Symmetry: C2
Subunit: 105 residues, 2 copies
């Protein structure tokens, strides 16, 4: 069961797309940056689908921008991701944490 994993990853990319959009507004549209920032306080980019649904009810344009961005970002990641390398880096990190233990000796 890795349904939880797929969901958490989509949540994270939704989150990352929110930050990307806020960064664009900060530079290019300061009144909307303020609006969106304030919106996010009460509607947290936690669960991606719930977040997007509530955002959409107040601003379809910002919801669509987050949607497009999250999908684009996910597409760029998977073209690049080396999962075998990540597995190896976990194994490397496990062994490194064990070594730290010997140091406290």
């Amino acid at each position: 069961t890795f349904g939880d994993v797929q969901k958490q990853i989509v949540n994270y990319f939704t989150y990352k797309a929110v930050r990307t959009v806020l960064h664009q507004l900060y530079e290019m549209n300061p009144p909307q940056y303020t609006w969106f920032y304030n919106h996010i306080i009460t509607n947290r980019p936690t669960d991606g689908k719930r977040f997007l649904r509530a955002l959409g009810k107040e601003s379809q344009e910002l919801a669509e921008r987050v949607m497009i961005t999250r999908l684009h970002l996910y597409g760029k990641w998977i073209k690049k991701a080396d999962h075998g390398k990540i597995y190896q880096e976990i194994s490397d990190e496990n062994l490194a944490l064990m070594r730290e233990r010997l140091m406290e000796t």
Copy 2:
């Protein structure tokens, strides 16, 4: 790039590993279950590495079980994960959401 994505994925498998070990302890080792539950109240499984360092200072056996379990879970995941499928699904969900607003 996307190093943040890697770090988060690793955090999440670490957390899923913690949950897996808790579930083992729940029936098979009640004294250790209550110990680990209480430990986690003040050492949260959010940054995996930091969580493991702190856990290791008090119980290297639990840290090791979480390390092995996170790695094996990641292994099982990558063997079947279909990332093209996930992409298609994010897209479909985007469309569904947009259609909810057309209705409303």
